[PDB]
PDB file of C-alpha atoms in Angstrom:
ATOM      1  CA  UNK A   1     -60.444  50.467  -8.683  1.00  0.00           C
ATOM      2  CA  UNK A   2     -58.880  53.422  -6.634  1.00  0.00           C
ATOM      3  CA  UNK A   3     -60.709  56.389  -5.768  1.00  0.00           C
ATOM      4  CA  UNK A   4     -58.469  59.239  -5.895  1.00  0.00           C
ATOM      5  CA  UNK A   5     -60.449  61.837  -5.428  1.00  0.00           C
ATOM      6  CA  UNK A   6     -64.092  61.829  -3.953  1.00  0.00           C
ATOM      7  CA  UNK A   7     -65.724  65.344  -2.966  1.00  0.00           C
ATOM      8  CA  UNK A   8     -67.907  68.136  -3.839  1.00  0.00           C
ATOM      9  CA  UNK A   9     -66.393  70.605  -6.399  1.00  0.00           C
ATOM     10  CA  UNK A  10     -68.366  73.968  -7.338  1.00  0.00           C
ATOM     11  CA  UNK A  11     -69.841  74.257 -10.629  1.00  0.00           C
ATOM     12  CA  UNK A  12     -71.172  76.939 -12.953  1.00  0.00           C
ATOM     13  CA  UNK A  13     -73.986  74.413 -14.637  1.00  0.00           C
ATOM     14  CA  UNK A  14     -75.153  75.482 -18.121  1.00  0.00           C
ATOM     15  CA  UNK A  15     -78.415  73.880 -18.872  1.00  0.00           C
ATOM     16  CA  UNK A  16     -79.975  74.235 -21.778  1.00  0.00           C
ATOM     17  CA  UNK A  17     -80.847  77.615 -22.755  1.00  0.00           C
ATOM     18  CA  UNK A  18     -80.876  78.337 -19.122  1.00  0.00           C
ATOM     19  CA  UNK A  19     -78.704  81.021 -17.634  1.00  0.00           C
ATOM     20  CA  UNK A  20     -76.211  80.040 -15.081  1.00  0.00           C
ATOM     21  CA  UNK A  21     -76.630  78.249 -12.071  1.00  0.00           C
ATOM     22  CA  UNK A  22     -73.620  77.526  -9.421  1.00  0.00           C
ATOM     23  CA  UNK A  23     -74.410  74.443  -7.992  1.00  0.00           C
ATOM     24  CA  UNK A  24     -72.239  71.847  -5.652  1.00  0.00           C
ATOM     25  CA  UNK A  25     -71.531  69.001  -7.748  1.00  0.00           C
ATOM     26  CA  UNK A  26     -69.970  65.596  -6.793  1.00  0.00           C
ATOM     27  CA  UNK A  27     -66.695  64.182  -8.031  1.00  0.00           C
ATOM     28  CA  UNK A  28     -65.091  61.247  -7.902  1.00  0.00           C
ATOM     29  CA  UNK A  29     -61.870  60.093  -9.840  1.00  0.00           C
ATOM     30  CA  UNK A  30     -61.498  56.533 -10.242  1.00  0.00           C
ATOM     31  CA  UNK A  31     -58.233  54.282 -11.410  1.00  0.00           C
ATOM     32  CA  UNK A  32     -57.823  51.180 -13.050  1.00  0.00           C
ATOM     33  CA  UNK A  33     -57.876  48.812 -15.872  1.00  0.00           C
ATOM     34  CA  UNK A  34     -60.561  48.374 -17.923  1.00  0.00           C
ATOM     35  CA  UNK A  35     -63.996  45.719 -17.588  1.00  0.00           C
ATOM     36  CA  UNK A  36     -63.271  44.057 -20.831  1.00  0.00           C
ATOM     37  CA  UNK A  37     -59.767  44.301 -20.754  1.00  0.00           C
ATOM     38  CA  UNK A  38     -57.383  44.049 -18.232  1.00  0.00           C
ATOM     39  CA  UNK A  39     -54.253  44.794 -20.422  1.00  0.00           C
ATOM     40  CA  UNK A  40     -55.985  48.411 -20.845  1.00  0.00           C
ATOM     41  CA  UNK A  41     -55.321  50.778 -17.931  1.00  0.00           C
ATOM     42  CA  UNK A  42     -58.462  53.690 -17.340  1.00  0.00           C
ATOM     43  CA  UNK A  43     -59.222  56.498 -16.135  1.00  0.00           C
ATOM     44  CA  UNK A  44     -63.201  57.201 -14.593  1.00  0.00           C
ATOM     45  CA  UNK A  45     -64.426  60.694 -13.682  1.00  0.00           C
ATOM     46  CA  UNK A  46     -68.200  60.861 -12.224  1.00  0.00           C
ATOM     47  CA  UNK A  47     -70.245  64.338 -12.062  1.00  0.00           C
ATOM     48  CA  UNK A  48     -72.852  63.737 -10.140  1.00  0.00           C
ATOM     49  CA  UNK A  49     -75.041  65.445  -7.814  1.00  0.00           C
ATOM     50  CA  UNK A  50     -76.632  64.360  -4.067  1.00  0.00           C
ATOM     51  CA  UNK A  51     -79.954  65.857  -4.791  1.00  0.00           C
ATOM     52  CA  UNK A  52     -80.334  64.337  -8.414  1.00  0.00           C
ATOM     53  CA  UNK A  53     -80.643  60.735  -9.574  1.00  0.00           C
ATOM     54  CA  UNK A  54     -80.772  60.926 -12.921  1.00  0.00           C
ATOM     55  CA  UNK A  55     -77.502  63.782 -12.891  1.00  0.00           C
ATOM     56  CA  UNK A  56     -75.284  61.413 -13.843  1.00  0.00           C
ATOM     57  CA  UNK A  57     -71.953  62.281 -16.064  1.00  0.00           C
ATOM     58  CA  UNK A  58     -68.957  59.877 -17.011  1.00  0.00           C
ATOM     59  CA  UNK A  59     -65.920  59.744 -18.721  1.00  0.00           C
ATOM     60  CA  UNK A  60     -63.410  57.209 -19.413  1.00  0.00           C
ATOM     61  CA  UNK A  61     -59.753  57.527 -20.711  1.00  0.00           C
ATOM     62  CA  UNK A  62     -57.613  54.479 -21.168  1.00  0.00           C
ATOM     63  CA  UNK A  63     -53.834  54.897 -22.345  1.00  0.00           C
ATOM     64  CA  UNK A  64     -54.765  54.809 -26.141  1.00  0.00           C
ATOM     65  CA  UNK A  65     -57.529  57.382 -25.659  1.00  0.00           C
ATOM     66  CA  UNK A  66     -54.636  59.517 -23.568  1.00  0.00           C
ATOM     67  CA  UNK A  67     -52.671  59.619 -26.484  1.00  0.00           C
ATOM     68  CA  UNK A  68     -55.131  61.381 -28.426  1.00  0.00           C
ATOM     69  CA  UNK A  69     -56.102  63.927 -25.486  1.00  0.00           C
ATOM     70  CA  UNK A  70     -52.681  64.719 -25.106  1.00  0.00           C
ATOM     71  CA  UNK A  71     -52.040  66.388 -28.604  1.00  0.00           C
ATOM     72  CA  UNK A  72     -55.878  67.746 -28.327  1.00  0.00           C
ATOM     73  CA  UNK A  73     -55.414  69.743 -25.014  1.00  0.00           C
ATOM     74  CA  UNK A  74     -51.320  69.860 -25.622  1.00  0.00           C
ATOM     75  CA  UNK A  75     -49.940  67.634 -22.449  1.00  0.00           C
ATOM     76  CA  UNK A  76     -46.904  67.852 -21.750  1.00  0.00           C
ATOM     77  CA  UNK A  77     -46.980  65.206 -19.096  1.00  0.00           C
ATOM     78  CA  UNK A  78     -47.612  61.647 -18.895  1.00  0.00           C
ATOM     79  CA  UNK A  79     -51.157  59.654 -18.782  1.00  0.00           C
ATOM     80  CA  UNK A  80     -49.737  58.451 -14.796  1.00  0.00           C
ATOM     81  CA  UNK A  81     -49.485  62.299 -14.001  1.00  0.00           C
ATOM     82  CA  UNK A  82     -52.569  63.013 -15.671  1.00  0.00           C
ATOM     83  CA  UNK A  83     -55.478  62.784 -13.030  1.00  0.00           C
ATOM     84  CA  UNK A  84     -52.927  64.539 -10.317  1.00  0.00           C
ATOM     85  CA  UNK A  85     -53.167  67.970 -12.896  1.00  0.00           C
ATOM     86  CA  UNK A  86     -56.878  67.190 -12.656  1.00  0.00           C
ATOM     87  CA  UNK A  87     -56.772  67.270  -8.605  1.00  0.00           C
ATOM     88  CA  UNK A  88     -54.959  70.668  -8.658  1.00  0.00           C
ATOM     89  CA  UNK A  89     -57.407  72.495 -10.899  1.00  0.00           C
ATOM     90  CA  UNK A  90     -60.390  71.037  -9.259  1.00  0.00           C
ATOM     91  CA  UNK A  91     -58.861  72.352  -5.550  1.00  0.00           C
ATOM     92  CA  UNK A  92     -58.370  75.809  -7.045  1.00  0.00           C
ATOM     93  CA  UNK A  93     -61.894  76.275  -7.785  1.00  0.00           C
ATOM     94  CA  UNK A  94     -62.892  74.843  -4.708  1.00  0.00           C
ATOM     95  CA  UNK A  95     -60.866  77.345  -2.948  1.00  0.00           C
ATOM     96  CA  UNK A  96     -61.935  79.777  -5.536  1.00  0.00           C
ATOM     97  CA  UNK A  97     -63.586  83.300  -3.967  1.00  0.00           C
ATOM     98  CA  UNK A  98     -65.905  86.177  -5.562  1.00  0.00           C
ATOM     99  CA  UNK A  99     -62.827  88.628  -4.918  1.00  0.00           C
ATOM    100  CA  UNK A 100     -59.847  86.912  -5.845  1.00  0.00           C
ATOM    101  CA  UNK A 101     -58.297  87.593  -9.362  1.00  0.00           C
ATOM    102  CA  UNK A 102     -57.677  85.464 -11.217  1.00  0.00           C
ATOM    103  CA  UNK A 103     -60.142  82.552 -10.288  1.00  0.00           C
ATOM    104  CA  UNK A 104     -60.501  79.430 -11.104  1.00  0.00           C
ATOM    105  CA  UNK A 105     -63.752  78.274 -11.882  1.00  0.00           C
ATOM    106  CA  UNK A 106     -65.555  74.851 -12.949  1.00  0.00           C
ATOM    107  CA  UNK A 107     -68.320  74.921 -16.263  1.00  0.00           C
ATOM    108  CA  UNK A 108     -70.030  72.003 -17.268  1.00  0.00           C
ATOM    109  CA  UNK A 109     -72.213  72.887 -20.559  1.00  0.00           C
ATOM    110  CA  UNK A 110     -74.886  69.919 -20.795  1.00  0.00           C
ATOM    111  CA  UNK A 111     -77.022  68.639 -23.743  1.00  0.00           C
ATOM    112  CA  UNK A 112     -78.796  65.787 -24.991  1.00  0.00           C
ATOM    113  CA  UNK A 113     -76.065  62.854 -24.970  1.00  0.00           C
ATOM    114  CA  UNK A 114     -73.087  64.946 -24.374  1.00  0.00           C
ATOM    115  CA  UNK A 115     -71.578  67.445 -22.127  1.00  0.00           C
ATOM    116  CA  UNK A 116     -68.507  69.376 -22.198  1.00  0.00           C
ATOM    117  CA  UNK A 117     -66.589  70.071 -18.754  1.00  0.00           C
ATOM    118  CA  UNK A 118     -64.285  72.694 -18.868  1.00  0.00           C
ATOM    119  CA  UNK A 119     -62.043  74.782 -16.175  1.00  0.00           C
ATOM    120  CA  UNK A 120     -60.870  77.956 -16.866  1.00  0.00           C
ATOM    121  CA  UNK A 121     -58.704  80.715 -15.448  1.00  0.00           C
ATOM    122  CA  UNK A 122     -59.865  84.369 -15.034  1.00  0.00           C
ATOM    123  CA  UNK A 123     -57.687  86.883 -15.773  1.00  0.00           C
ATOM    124  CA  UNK A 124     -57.776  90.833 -16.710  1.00  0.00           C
ATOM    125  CA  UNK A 125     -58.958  90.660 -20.045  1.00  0.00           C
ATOM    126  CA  UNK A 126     -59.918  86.787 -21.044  1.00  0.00           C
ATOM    127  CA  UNK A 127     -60.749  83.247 -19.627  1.00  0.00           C
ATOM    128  CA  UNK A 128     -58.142  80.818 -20.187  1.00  0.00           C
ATOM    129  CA  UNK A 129     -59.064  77.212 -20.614  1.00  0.00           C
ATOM    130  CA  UNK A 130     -57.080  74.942 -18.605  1.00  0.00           C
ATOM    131  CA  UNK A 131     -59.212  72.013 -19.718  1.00  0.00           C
ATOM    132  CA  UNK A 132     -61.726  70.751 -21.836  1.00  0.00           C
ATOM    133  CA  UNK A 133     -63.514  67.448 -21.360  1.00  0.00           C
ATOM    134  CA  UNK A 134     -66.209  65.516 -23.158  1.00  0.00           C
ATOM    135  CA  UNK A 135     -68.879  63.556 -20.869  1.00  0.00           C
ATOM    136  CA  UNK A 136     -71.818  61.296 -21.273  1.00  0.00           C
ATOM    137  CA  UNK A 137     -74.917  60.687 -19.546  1.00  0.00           C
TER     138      UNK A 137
ATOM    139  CA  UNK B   1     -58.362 103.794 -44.709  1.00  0.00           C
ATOM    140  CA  UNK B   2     -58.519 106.743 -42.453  1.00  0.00           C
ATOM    141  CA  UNK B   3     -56.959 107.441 -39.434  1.00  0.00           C
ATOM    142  CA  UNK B   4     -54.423 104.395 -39.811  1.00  0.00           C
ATOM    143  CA  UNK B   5     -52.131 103.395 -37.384  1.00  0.00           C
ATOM    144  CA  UNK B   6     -49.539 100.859 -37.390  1.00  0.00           C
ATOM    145  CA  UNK B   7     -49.598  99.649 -33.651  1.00  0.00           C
ATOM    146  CA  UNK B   8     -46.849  96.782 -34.224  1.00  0.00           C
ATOM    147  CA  UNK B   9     -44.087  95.836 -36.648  1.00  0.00           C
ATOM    148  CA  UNK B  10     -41.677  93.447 -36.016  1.00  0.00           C
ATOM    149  CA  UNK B  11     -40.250  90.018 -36.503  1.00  0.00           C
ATOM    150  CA  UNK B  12     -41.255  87.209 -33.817  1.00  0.00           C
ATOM    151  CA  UNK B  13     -40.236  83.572 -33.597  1.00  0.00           C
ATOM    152  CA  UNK B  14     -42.406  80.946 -34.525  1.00  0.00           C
ATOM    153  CA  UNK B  15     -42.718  77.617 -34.011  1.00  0.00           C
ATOM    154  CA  UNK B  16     -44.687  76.492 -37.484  1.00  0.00           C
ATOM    155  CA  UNK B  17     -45.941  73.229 -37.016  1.00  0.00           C
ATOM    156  CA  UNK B  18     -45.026  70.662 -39.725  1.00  0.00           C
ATOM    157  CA  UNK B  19     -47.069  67.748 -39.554  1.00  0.00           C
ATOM    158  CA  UNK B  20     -45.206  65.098 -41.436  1.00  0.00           C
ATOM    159  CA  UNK B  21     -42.130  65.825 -39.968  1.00  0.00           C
ATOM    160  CA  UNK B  22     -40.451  67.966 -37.147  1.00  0.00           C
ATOM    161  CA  UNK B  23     -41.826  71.492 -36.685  1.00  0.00           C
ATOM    162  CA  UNK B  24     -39.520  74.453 -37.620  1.00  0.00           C
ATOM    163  CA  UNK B  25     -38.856  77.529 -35.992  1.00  0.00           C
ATOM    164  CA  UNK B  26     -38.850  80.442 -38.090  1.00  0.00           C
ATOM    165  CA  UNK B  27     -38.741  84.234 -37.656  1.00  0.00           C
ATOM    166  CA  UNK B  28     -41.977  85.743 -39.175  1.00  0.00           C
ATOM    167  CA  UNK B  29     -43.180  89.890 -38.969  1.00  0.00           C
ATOM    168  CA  UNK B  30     -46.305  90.945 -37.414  1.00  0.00           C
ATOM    169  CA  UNK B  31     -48.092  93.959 -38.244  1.00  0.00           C
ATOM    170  CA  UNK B  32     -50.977  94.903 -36.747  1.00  0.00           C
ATOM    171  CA  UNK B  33     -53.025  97.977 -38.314  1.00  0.00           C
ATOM    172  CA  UNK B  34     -55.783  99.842 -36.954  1.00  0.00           C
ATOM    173  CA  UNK B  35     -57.731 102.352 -38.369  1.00  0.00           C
ATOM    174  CA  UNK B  36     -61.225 103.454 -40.026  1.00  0.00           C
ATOM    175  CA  UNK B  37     -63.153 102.565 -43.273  1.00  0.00           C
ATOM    176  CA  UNK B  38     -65.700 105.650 -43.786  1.00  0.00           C
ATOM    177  CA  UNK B  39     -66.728 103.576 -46.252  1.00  0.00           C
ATOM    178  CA  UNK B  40     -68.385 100.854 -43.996  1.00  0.00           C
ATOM    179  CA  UNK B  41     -70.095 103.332 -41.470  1.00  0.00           C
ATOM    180  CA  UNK B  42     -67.275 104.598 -40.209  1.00  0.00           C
ATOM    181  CA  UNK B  43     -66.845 101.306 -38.409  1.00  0.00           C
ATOM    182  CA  UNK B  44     -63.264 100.435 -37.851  1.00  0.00           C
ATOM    183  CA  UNK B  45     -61.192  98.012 -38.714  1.00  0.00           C
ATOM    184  CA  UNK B  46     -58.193  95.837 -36.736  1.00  0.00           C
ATOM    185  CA  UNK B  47     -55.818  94.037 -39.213  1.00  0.00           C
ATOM    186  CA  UNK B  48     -53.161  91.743 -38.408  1.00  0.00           C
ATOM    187  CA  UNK B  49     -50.489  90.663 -40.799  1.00  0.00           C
ATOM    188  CA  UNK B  50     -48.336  87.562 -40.834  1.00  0.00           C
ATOM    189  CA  UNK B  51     -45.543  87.274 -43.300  1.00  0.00           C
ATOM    190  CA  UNK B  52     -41.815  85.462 -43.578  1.00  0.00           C
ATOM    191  CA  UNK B  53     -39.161  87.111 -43.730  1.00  0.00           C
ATOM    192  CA  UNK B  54     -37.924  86.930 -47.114  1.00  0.00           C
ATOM    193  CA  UNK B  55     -38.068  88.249 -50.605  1.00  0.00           C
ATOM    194  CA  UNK B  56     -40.458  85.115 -51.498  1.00  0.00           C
ATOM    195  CA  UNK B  57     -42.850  84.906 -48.876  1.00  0.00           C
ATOM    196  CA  UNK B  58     -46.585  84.269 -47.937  1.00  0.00           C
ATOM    197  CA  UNK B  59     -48.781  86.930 -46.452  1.00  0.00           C
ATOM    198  CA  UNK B  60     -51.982  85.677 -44.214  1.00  0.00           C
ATOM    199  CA  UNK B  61     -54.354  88.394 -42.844  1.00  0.00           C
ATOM    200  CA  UNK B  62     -56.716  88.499 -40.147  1.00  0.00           C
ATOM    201  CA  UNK B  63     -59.677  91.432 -40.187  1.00  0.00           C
ATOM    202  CA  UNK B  64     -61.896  92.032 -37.601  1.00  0.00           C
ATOM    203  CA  UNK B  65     -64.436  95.116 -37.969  1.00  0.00           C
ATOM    204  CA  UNK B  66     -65.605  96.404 -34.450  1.00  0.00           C
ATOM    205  CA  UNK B  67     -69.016  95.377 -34.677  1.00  0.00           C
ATOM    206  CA  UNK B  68     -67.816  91.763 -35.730  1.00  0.00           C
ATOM    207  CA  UNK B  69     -65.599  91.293 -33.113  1.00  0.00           C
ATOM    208  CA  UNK B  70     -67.958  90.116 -30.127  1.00  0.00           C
ATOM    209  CA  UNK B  71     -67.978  87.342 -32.725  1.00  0.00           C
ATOM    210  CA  UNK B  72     -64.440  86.892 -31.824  1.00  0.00           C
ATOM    211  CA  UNK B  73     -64.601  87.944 -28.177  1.00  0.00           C
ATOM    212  CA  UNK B  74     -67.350  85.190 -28.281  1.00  0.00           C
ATOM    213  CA  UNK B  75     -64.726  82.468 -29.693  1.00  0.00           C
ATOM    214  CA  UNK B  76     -61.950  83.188 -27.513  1.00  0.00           C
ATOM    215  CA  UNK B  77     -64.188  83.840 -24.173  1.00  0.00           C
ATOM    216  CA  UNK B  78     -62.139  88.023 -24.032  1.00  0.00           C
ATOM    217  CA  UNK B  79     -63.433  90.017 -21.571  1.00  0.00           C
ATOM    218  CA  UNK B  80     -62.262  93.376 -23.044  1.00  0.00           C
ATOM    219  CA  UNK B  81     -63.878  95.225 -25.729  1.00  0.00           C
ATOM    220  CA  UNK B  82     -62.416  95.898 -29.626  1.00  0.00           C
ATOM    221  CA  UNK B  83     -60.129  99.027 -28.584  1.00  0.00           C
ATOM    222  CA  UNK B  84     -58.077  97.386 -25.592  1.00  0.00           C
ATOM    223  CA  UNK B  85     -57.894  93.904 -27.480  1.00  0.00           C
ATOM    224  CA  UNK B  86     -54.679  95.473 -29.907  1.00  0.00           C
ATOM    225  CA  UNK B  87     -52.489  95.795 -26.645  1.00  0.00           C
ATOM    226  CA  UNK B  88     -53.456  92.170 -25.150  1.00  0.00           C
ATOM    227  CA  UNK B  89     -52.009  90.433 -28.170  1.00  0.00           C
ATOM    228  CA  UNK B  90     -49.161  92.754 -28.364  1.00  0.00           C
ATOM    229  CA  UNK B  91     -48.300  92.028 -25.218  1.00  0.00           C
ATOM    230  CA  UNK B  92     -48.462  88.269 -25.597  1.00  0.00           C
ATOM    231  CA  UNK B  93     -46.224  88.565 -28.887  1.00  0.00           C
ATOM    232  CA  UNK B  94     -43.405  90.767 -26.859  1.00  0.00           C
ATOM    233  CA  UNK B  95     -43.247  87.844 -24.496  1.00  0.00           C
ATOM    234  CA  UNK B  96     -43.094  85.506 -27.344  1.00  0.00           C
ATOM    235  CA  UNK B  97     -39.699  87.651 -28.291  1.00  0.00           C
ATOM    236  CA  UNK B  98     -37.793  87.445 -25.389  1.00  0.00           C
ATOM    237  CA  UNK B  99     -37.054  83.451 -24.395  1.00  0.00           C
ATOM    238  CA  UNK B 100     -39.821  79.285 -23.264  1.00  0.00           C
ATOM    239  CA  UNK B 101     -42.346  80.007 -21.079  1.00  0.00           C
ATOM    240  CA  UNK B 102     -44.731  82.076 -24.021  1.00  0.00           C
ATOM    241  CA  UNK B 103     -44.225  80.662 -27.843  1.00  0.00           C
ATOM    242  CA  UNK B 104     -46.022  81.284 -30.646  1.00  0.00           C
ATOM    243  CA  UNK B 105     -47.397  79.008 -32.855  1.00  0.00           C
ATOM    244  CA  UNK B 106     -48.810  78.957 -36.042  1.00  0.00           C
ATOM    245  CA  UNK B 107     -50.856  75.605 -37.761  1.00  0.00           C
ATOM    246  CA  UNK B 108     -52.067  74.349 -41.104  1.00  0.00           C
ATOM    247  CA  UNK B 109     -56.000  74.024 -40.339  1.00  0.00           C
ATOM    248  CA  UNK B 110     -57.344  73.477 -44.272  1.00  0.00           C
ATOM    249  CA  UNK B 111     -57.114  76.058 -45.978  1.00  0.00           C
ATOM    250  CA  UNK B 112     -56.516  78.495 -43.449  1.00  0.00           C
ATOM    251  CA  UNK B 113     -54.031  78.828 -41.086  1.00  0.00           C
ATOM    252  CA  UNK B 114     -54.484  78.839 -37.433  1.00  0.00           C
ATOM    253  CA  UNK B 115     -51.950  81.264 -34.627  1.00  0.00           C
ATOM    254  CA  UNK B 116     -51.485  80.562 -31.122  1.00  0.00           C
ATOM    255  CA  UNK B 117     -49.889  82.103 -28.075  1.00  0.00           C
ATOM    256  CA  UNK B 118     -49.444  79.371 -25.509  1.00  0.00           C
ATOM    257  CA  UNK B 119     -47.709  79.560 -22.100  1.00  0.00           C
ATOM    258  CA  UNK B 120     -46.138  76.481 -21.254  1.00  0.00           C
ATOM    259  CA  UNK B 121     -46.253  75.723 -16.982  1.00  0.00           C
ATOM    260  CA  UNK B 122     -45.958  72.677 -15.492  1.00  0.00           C
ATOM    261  CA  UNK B 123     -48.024  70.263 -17.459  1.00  0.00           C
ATOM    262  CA  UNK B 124     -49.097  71.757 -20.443  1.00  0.00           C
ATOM    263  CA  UNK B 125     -49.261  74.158 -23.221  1.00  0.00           C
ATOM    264  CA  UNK B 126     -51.829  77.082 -22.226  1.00  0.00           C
ATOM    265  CA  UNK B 127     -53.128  78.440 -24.980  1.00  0.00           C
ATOM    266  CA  UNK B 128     -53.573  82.304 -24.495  1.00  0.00           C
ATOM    267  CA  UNK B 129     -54.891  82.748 -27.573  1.00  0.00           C
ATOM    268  CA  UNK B 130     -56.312  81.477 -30.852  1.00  0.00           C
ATOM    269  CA  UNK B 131     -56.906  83.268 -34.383  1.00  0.00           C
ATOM    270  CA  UNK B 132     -57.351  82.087 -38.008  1.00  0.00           C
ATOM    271  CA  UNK B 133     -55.816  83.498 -40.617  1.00  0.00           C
ATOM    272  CA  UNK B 134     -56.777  83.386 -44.071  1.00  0.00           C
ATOM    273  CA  UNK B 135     -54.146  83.178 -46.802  1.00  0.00           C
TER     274      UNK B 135
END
């Protein structure tokens, strides 16, 4: 495994029916092959938070499962330059400020089973989703 | 309709996704009409209009009445209301004409169809945004 990335990005958490609530969540970005297959090269991402236990939120995304992502979200690049795309937009909302137009920020909606992470970029008249992941408890 | 206004009319290039085989790029016109139907409250009414540009063509439409369109503003996460949302998209499609950093696309999604304005940057294709159409 490689950590690649491994600190505290700000968050607009969206519990359930529960307004917004900007919290300082924990992320780490892992490398690798796969545990039951070492011919399979992954990807780990972990949400979690330092004053929660049971805040935990994975996802994994080995070459095949790329492929699919790709044409989902539209990548143009490859599954190598994938998490470093990642990196950038999770630095511009870290950097992100009240004033600042546009700004970057982090939303992770959460439900039972799933939740959906998504970063999006404010401009004058709409929020555009630079984007959209699925993770699971 | 009263009051009706023809706020766009021209053709813009799009890439039409084939799904089979290679995608084509084809010129289609875009009209987008405003104006008001006194005969649903006096509630207006935003239609857009996507045709090819031939004497055998198909013609999808898009209409959004102003009280139905925080349905849309809802979808697409807009932050302006009904009346400025005509010169957003307008904008996006005038891009769309000259060179690509902004393309538009436009996708088989059952029996609908599905447009797209996407900016492509540095590792991906943007979208800037998303309507169905209905044929």
């Amino acid at each position: 495994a490689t950590t690649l990335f491994w600190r505290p990005v700000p968050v607009h958490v969206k519990q359930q029916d529960r307004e917004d609530v900007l919290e300082e969540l924990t992320f780490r970005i892992l490398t690798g092959v796969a545990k039951q297959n070492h011919n399979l090269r992954i990807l780990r991402i972990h949400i979690s938070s330092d004053s929660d236990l049971f805040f935990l939120h994975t996802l994994e995304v080995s070459e095949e499962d790329f492929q699919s992502l790709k044409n989902d979200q539209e990548i143009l690049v490859d599954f190598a330059s994938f998490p470093g795309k990642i990196i950038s937009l999770l630095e511009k909302c870290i950097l992100a400020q009240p004033g600042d137009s546009p700004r970057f920020q982090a939303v992770l909606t959460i439900r039972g089973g799933e939740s959906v992470f998504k970063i999006v970029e404010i401009n004058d008249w709409k929020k555009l989703p630079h984007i959209t992941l699925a993770f699971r408890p």
